[PDB]
């Protein structure tokens, strides 16, 4: 698994670190993948550039 998370900017660097630690963990537990092969990428975006379910 190579997970890429796109979220709005604004979270503290600490909250982002924990977010990545949590995704590695939640993946390993639900898919049984060795973290050695789990790769995570966190990328922030301005709210303006993100449209979910057609909402502007």
């Amino acid at each position: 698994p190579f997970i890429e998370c796109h979220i709005a900017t604004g979270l503290s660097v600490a909250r982002k670190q924990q977010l990545i630690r949590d995704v590695i963990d939640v993946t390993n537990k639900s898919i049984g993948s060795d973290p050695k092969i789990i790769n995570v990428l966190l990328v922030e975006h301005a709210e303006a550039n993100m449209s979910i379910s057609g909402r502007i």
Partner: protein, 62 residues
Amino acid sequence: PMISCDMRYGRTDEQKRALSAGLLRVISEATGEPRENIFFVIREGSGINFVEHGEHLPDYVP
């Protein structure tokens, strides 16, 4: 927020909803964003298409 997970083919439907259930939780938990406001997509390929540490992975075996 949008989340994508590129992984080898083979994972069961059960494993995928567990994955999504978990991925959306931690993301909504760290973002304070509701679940209905999260998008998730799983992309799949052959193991040969997945190169870890330089070595191509063998096809996934469920």
